[PDB]
Amino acid sequence: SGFRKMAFPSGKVEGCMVQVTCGTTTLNGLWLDDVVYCPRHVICTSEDMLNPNYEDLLIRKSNHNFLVQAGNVQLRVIGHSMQNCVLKLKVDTANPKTPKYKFVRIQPGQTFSVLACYNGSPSGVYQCAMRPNFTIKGSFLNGSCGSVGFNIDYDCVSFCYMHHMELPTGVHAGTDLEGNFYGPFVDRQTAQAAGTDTTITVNVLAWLYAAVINGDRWFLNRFTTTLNDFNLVAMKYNYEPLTQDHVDILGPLSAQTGIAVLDMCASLKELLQNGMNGRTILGSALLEDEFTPFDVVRQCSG
Amino acid sequence: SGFRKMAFPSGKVEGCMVQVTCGTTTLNGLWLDDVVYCPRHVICPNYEDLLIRKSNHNFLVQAGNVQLRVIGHSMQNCVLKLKVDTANPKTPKYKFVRIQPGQTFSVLACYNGSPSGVYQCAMRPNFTIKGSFLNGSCGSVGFNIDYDCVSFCYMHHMELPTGVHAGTDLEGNFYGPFVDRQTAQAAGTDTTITVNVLAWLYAAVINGDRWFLNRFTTTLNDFNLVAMKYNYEPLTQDHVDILGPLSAQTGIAVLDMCASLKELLQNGMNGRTILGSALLEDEFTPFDVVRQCSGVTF
Ligand SMILES: O=C1[C@@H](c2cccc(Cl)c2)CCN1c1cncc2ccccc12
Ligand SMILES: O=C1[C@@H](c2cccc(Cl)c2)CCN1c1cncc2ccccc12
Ligand SMILES: [Cl-]
Are residues A139 and B14, on separate chains, in Cβ contact within 8 Å? Answer: no
Partners of B59 in beta bridges:
B22
- Residue ranges around ligand 1 (CB below 6 Å): A 41, 49, 140-142, 144-145, 164-166, 187, 189; B 1
Q: Chain A residues with CB inside 8 Å of B294's CB?
A: 141
Superfamily of domain A198-301: main proteinase (3clpro) structure, domain 3 (1.10.1840.10)
- Residue ranges around ligand 2 (CB below 6 Å): A 1; B 41, 133-135, 137-138, 157-159, 180-182
Ranges in chain B annotated CATH 1.10.1840.10: 191-294
Distances (CA, A) of A81 to A76, A86, A90, B252: 15, 9, 8, 49
Distance CA A65, CA A59 (A): 12
Distance CA B167, CA B153 (A): 10
Distances (CA, A) of A58 to A41, A88, B6, B238: 10, 11, 36, 54
In CATH, the architecture of B15-92 is Beta Barrel (2.40)
Closest residue to atom 22 of ligand 1, CA basis: A142
Distance CA B67, CA B65 (A): 7
Q: Chain B residues with CB inside 8 Å of A123's CB?
A: 9, 291, 295-298
Distance of CA B150 to the CA centre of its chain: 13
Are residues A123 and B296, on separate chains, in Cβ contact within 8 Å? Answer: yes
Q: How many CB pairs under 8 A join A and B?
A: 141
Distance CA A229, CA B148 (A): 55
B158 alpha carbon to ligand 2 midpoint, in Å? 4
* Resolution given for this structure, in angstroms: 2.1
Helices (H), chain A: 11-14, 54-59, 201-213, 227-235, 244-249, 251-257, 261-274, 293-301
- Among B231, B267, B273, B53, CA closest to A286: B273
A141 alpha carbon to ligand 1 midpoint, in Å? 8
Ranges in chain B annotated CATH 2.40.10.10: 1-14+93-190, 15-92
* Four-way CATH pick for B191-294: 3.30.460.10, 3.40.50.10380, 1.10.1840.10, 1.10.357.10: 1.10.1840.10
Which amino acid makes up residue B297? T
What DSSP string runs through B74-134? EEETTEEEEEESS--TT--EEEE-PPPTT-EEEEEEEETTEEEEEEEEE--TTS-B-----
- Using what technique was this structure determined? X-ray
Neighbouring residues of B29: CB distance < 8 A, sequence distance ≥ 6:
B17, B18, B19, B20, B36, B37, B38, B61, B82, B113, B139
Distance CA B126, CA B129 (A): 9
Which CATH topology does A15-99 take? Thrombin, subunit H (2.40.10)
The shortest C-alpha distance from B55 to chain A (Å) reads 32
**What top-level class would CATH report for the domain A1-14+100-197?**
mainly beta
Is residue B39 within 8 Å of residue B79, measured between CB atoms? yes
Distance CA B201, CA B262 (A): 12
Which amino acid makes up residue A187? D
Ranges in chain A annotated CATH 1.10.1840.10: 198-301
Which amino acid makes up residue B32? L
Ranges in chain A annotated CATH 2.40.10.10: 1-14+100-197, 15-99
A86 alpha carbon to ligand 1 midpoint, in Å? 15
Q: Chain B residues with CB inside 8 Å of A124's CB?
A: 4, 6-9, 291-292
Distance CA B56, CA B51 (A): 10
Is residue B39 within 8 Å of residue B80, measured between CB atoms? yes
- Among A206, A216, A237, CA closest to A283: A216
**CB atoms closer than 10 angstroms to residue B187:** 20
Which CATH topology does B1-14+93-190 take? Thrombin, subunit H (2.40.10)
Ligand 1: nearest atom to the Cα of B1 = 19
Going by their DSSP bridges, the two strands B149-159 and B141-146 should be labelled as: antiparallel
Neighbouring residues of B114: CB distance < 8 A, sequence distance ≥ 6:
B17, B19
Handedness of CA A93, A96, A97, A101 (dihedral sign): positive
